[PDB]
Amino acid sequence: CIINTTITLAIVVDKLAPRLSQLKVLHKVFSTGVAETRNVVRASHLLNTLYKAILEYD
Amino acid sequence: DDRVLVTETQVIRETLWLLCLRSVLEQIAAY
Amino acid sequence: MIHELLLALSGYPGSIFTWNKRSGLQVSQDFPFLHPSETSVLNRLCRLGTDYIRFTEFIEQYTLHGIYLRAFCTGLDSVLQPYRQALLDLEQEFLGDPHLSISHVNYFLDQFQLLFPSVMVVVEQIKSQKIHGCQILETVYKHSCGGLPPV
Amino acid sequence: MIHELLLALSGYPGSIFTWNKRSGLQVSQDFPFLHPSETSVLNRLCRLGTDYIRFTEFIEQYTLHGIYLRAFCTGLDSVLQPYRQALLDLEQEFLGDPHLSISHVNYFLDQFQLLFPSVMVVVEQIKSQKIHGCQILETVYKHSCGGLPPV
């Protein structure tokens, strides 16, 4: 729709509200999947963070 | 101090690729 | 100035429309280009902008905790959707004919001007009494039996 | 430049996309016609081309000997078939509308970008440890129990 209606800054942002919201969650869910050495603690602590982070959003 | 003086629509295209001007861009940068 | 205003009513304040942390949106002072009689209707128009800003600031802040507070804000954006959509339209009408004045722009808000005020104290009762838990499903219900059809 | 790139991702390097025997495919330097911010995504895009070239060079070289090495390369082209077929398509979409940018082209690869990397070290273990004989049917199997569904 840019190459082919007027479009400016304040419109594309508000159009992307339900995405820039969903994206902020991943910055906190993934932050606990990156801050950590054995292969069994990096995978257990990750998979357990999700099941904890979902019960927060219920 | 010199500046590039970009047009307006060019910014949105650039923002899509990333996906007061120094202020508004600073927020999208955080994304 | 039209597209300048339609951003001020969106949540972005500027030089013409200064922002104050206590009072709210308001016009700075007299402007030579415009008439000195409009300095009033805008102030009457900003009484609406202050509501949306104080709304979205609270919506983002999420503030108190509990799912019933999360969902209230989640729903609070839904009722606030026709406000935004009706604001995007104003630009389209002004893009067509360049003979429309602030009078027509003020006229277009009509319904939002008599809705926000009644849906402003519902938020104020929450942040001023620490309404925690399912008790929200009554504090909002006790105000649901209001006379105003729109509310 | 589009059809220029779609050849660089096929195994043919040129002036815009120089070839280095050690590093791999990469953009030469800044170009005035294009933006200076794209010089990155292409370099992110070439990390895929380097894989296909180093693949097909090894596939042709057949290098070590043994039928189980011949058949491995014989099969290695089969998994690499959807990569080529999905590349022929990109030209057709660009032939229709001339408003598509590199962003969409980068987006189309999607699956190939997360597959080649995991199927790159399987080759490296062979050429670096002289895996001769039927022992390949385990070295490939020990990596077949990976989590990535595509792999």
XYZ file of C-alpha atoms in Angstrom:
391
model
C 0.000 0.000 0.000
C 3.008 2.356 -0.094
C 3.908 1.991 -3.767
C 0.376 1.639 -5.133
C -3.984 6.399 0.109
C -1.864 8.639 2.316
C 0.450 7.007 4.857
C 2.654 8.691 7.456
C 4.441 7.864 10.703
C 1.660 8.142 13.283
C -0.505 5.765 11.218
C 1.846 2.819 10.693
C 2.682 2.746 14.404
C -0.912 2.600 15.619
C -1.626 0.048 12.896
C 1.126 -2.109 14.435
C -0.089 -1.881 18.038
C -1.189 -5.547 18.437
C 2.262 -6.583 17.164
C 4.560 -4.266 19.110
C 2.639 -5.543 22.128
C 3.177 -9.231 21.373
C 6.828 -8.484 20.633
C 7.541 -6.979 24.054
C 6.568 -10.279 25.693
C 9.254 -12.152 23.758
C 11.918 -9.747 25.002
C 11.130 -10.991 28.523
C 10.412 -14.650 27.742
C 13.614 -15.009 25.708
C 15.684 -13.014 28.214
C 15.395 -16.013 30.546
C 16.311 -18.366 27.693
C 19.583 -16.537 26.996
C 21.015 -15.606 30.423
C 21.862 -19.301 30.996
C 26.302 -24.675 30.919
C 25.382 -28.351 30.832
C 22.896 -29.316 28.140
C 20.350 -30.573 30.685
C 20.055 -27.352 32.699
C 19.858 -25.043 29.672
C 16.904 -27.021 28.312
C 15.105 -27.691 31.594
C 15.302 -24.089 32.811
C 14.051 -22.849 29.442
C 11.079 -25.200 29.140
C 10.098 -24.487 32.741
C 10.144 -20.713 32.207
C 7.298 -20.927 29.686
C 4.955 -22.964 31.884
C 5.626 -20.429 34.627
C 5.177 -17.400 32.367
C 1.842 -18.693 31.071
C 0.298 -19.088 34.522
C 1.123 -15.408 35.006
C -1.083 -14.555 31.998
C -4.158 -16.583 32.966
C 26.369 21.015 11.280
C 25.321 19.204 8.108
C 22.373 16.842 7.754
C 21.119 14.493 5.070
C 17.506 15.797 4.923
C 15.784 12.539 4.052
C 12.230 12.551 2.730
C 9.265 11.268 4.724
C 8.070 8.062 3.058
C 11.677 6.770 2.926
C 11.629 6.472 6.747
C 8.647 4.115 6.851
C 10.269 1.792 4.275
C 13.475 1.795 6.412
C 11.382 1.149 9.586
C 9.748 -1.884 7.852
C 13.240 -3.297 7.068
C 14.196 -2.879 10.782
C 10.978 -4.830 11.670
C 11.456 14.627 17.782
C 12.667 12.473 14.898
C 15.545 11.352 17.102
C 12.863 10.684 19.715
C 10.363 8.697 17.645
C 13.088 6.661 15.955
C 14.672 5.936 19.335
C 11.530 4.072 20.378
C 11.302 1.977 17.210
C 15.014 1.290 17.611
C 14.240 -0.299 20.977
C 11.994 -2.664 19.038
C -2.711 23.119 11.425
C -5.476 20.535 10.828
C -3.037 17.610 10.604
C -1.236 19.268 13.509
C -4.378 19.028 15.640
C -5.318 15.504 14.557
C -2.014 14.394 16.060
C -2.554 16.369 19.262
C -5.844 14.496 19.644
C -3.898 11.258 19.128
C -1.428 11.537 22.005
C 1.445 13.582 20.578
C 1.859 17.104 21.998
C 3.808 19.865 20.322
C 4.644 23.566 20.395
C 1.106 24.747 19.505
C -0.465 22.274 21.975
C 1.738 22.155 25.057
C 1.427 19.366 27.617
C 1.241 19.835 31.384
C 1.528 16.965 33.844
C -1.257 18.268 36.119
C -3.806 20.236 34.087
C -3.709 18.474 30.713
C -3.618 19.420 27.061
C -4.200 23.111 26.368
C -3.279 25.808 23.865
C -0.193 27.840 24.720
C -1.344 31.416 23.994
C -2.776 33.681 21.291
C -1.643 33.010 17.679
C -1.734 35.836 15.034
C -2.541 33.655 11.951
C -5.672 32.132 13.612
C -8.601 34.121 15.136
C -8.638 34.968 18.909
C -12.135 33.399 19.337
C -10.993 29.832 18.412
C -8.626 29.789 21.458
C -11.745 28.590 23.320
C -13.175 25.747 21.229
C -9.756 24.092 21.097
C -9.575 24.198 24.894
C -13.048 22.611 24.815
C -11.615 20.078 22.274
C -8.540 19.262 24.420
C -10.773 18.273 27.377
C -11.136 15.140 25.169
C -7.449 14.693 24.328
C -6.475 14.787 27.999
C -8.806 11.787 28.506
C -7.179 9.654 25.771
C -3.657 10.435 26.965
C -4.471 9.725 30.610
C -6.200 6.618 29.278
C -3.350 5.187 27.215
C -0.758 6.086 29.852
C -2.716 4.030 32.374
C -3.359 1.273 29.822
C 0.360 0.848 29.200
C 1.345 1.179 32.859
C -0.994 -1.696 33.837
C -1.314 -0.006 37.236
C -2.076 -2.994 42.001
C -2.103 -6.254 40.060
C -4.364 -9.154 39.189
C -5.782 -10.704 36.046
C -9.075 -8.833 36.433
C -7.060 -5.630 36.139
C -5.155 -6.946 33.118
C -8.364 -7.916 31.336
C -10.064 -4.625 32.206
C -7.355 -2.721 30.346
C -7.436 -5.371 27.613
C -11.117 -4.597 27.150
C -10.677 -0.874 27.751
C -8.892 -0.593 24.409
C -11.824 -2.204 22.584
C -14.336 0.471 23.585
C -11.618 3.031 22.714
C -11.289 1.624 19.165
C -14.110 3.614 17.477
C -12.436 6.771 18.828
C -9.228 6.102 16.867
C -11.040 4.894 13.749
C -13.253 7.975 13.734
C -10.101 10.082 14.005
C -8.383 8.542 10.980
C -11.452 9.519 8.963
C -11.181 13.296 9.695
C -7.884 13.427 7.694
C -9.575 11.808 4.622
C -12.422 14.408 4.555
C -9.841 17.253 4.880
C -7.714 15.648 2.098
C -10.697 15.985 -0.306
C -11.951 19.600 0.038
C -9.617 22.254 1.602
C -12.548 24.484 2.746
C -13.342 22.629 6.032
C -12.736 24.636 9.277
C -12.217 23.575 12.929
C -16.003 23.917 13.421
C -16.627 20.744 11.320
C -13.671 18.942 13.031
C -15.143 19.824 16.487
C -18.597 18.667 15.222
C -17.213 15.241 14.094
C -16.099 14.207 17.648
C -19.716 14.782 18.984
C -20.271 11.268 20.534
C -16.727 10.941 22.029
C -17.167 14.320 23.863
C -20.192 12.977 25.857
C -18.747 9.446 26.443
C -15.160 9.840 27.825
C -16.271 12.104 30.772
C -18.625 9.398 32.197
C -15.976 6.654 31.579
C -13.256 8.740 33.334
C -14.417 8.418 36.965
C -14.684 4.635 36.612
C -10.913 4.596 36.196
C -10.436 7.144 38.975
C -12.335 5.028 41.499
C -9.970 2.128 40.797
C -6.662 3.975 41.157
C -7.920 5.837 44.248
C -9.354 2.937 46.288
C -7.086 -0.033 45.438
C -9.931 -2.104 44.011
C -8.218 -5.498 44.012
C -9.673 -8.785 42.839
C -13.079 -9.712 41.454
C -14.560 -6.649 43.194
C -14.077 -4.885 39.856
C -16.926 -6.924 38.359
C -19.237 -4.936 40.655
C -17.611 -1.496 40.630
C -17.963 -1.548 36.861
C -21.446 -3.054 37.151
C -22.746 -0.442 39.600
C -21.919 2.114 36.890
C -23.403 -0.037 34.118
C -26.945 0.873 35.220
C -26.376 4.482 34.062
C -29.005 6.372 32.002
C -26.737 7.570 29.124
C -27.453 5.024 26.301
C -23.889 5.313 24.821
C -22.331 4.529 28.266
C 19.771 -6.157 -9.468
C 17.092 -8.701 -8.453
C 17.953 -11.110 -11.284
C 21.576 -10.287 -10.491
C 21.120 -11.546 -6.930
C 19.072 -14.615 -7.859
C 22.106 -15.777 -9.823
C 24.513 -15.011 -6.984
C 22.358 -17.258 -4.796
C 22.629 -19.922 -7.511
C 26.409 -20.312 -7.641
C 27.546 -17.612 -10.068
C 29.510 -14.712 -8.543
C 30.001 -11.361 -10.205
C 31.259 -7.812 -9.732
C 28.548 -6.806 -7.214
C 28.945 -10.101 -5.296
C 32.635 -10.961 -5.219
C 33.846 -14.440 -4.300
C 36.630 -15.233 -1.837
C 38.133 -18.693 -1.454
C 38.292 -18.508 2.363
C 35.500 -16.285 3.692
C 32.719 -16.845 1.151
C 30.218 -14.770 -0.766
C 29.996 -11.140 0.340
C 29.200 -7.697 -1.038
C 32.177 -5.720 -2.305
C 31.547 -2.251 -0.820
C 29.020 0.591 -0.645
C 26.921 1.248 -3.798
C 25.396 4.746 -4.450
C 22.180 3.599 -6.254
C 21.147 1.285 -3.344
C 20.776 2.342 0.344
C 23.727 1.919 2.807
C 21.531 -0.081 5.266
C 20.923 -3.011 2.830
C 24.704 -3.770 2.784
C 23.889 -5.842 5.894
C 20.897 -8.000 4.949
C 22.682 -9.135 1.793
C 25.656 -10.238 3.890
C 23.093 -12.089 6.032
C 21.649 -13.495 2.735
C 25.070 -14.612 1.403
C 25.677 -16.742 4.536
C 23.227 -19.016 2.626
C 24.872 -18.758 -0.798
C 28.257 -19.743 0.619
C 26.604 -22.986 1.823
C 25.212 -23.930 -1.619
C 28.495 -23.192 -3.382
C 30.573 -25.123 -0.851
C 27.910 -27.806 -1.203
C 27.930 -28.173 -4.983
C 31.719 -27.889 -5.168
C 31.983 -30.851 -2.805
C 29.165 -32.693 -4.592
C 30.998 -32.481 -7.907
C 34.423 -33.239 -6.437
C 33.141 -36.516 -4.917
C 35.784 -36.056 -2.213
C 38.320 -40.483 0.271
C 36.262 -42.927 -1.775
C 33.643 -45.624 -1.395
C 30.105 -46.226 -2.586
C 28.631 -44.956 0.686
C 30.277 -41.627 -0.097
C 28.996 -41.681 -3.679
C 25.439 -42.375 -2.550
C 25.598 -39.749 0.198
C 26.282 -37.059 -2.397
C 23.707 -38.680 -4.685
C 21.149 -38.211 -1.928
C 22.554 -34.855 -0.841
C 21.245 -33.317 -4.059
C 17.716 -34.568 -3.350
C 17.345 -32.653 -0.085
C 18.891 -29.665 -1.922
C 16.194 -29.810 -4.638
C 13.489 -27.707 -2.897
C 16.140 -24.989 -2.477
C 16.601 -24.631 -6.252
C 12.893 -24.964 -7.031
C 12.026 -22.307 -4.465
C 14.623 -20.064 -6.101
C 13.179 -20.348 -9.610
C 9.887 -19.120 -8.161
C 11.291 -15.774 -6.854
C 11.924 -14.642 -10.488
C 8.254 -15.362 -11.451
C 6.856 -13.212 -8.573
C 9.263 -10.355 -9.529
C 8.249 -10.734 -13.227
C 4.608 -9.973 -12.254
C 4.717 -6.823 -10.057
C 7.858 -4.573 -10.161
C 7.246 -3.169 -6.623
C 8.861 -6.058 -4.644
C 12.038 -5.149 -2.643
C 14.908 -7.264 -1.225
C 12.920 -7.520 2.043
C 10.376 -9.896 0.383
C 13.218 -11.815 -1.393
C 15.021 -12.260 1.988
C 11.660 -13.323 3.550
C 11.081 -16.028 0.853
C 14.264 -18.022 1.771
C 13.056 -18.310 5.467
C 13.225 -22.175 5.776
C 16.548 -22.571 3.851
C 18.250 -20.034 6.225
C 17.566 -22.273 9.298
C 18.288 -25.622 7.520
C 21.685 -25.300 5.705
C 23.589 -24.243 8.915
C 22.660 -27.506 10.754
C 23.394 -29.595 7.587
C 26.822 -27.896 7.136
C 28.737 -29.497 10.036
C 27.619 -32.970 8.944
C 29.708 -32.456 5.819
C 32.553 -30.901 7.804
C 32.844 -33.914 10.105
C 33.305 -36.153 7.060
C 36.021 -34.166 5.283
C 37.866 -33.549 8.572
C 37.952 -37.091 10.012
C 38.228 -39.360 6.936
C 34.968 -41.162 7.677
C 35.449 -44.165 5.394
C 33.049 -47.039 4.874
C 29.670 -47.841 6.396
C 30.578 -45.685 9.417
C 28.710 -42.898 7.620
C 25.401 -44.649 8.331
C 26.002 -43.775 11.998
C 27.644 -40.352 11.737
C 24.590 -39.226 9.802
C 22.311 -41.121 12.189
C 23.785 -39.598 15.353
C 22.749 -36.229 13.887
C 19.338 -37.524 12.787
C 18.065 -37.414 16.386
C 18.216 -33.586 16.322
C 15.338 -31.437 17.673
C 14.851 -29.133 14.620
C 11.821 -30.697 12.792
C 13.044 -29.554 9.303
C 16.474 -31.228 9.890
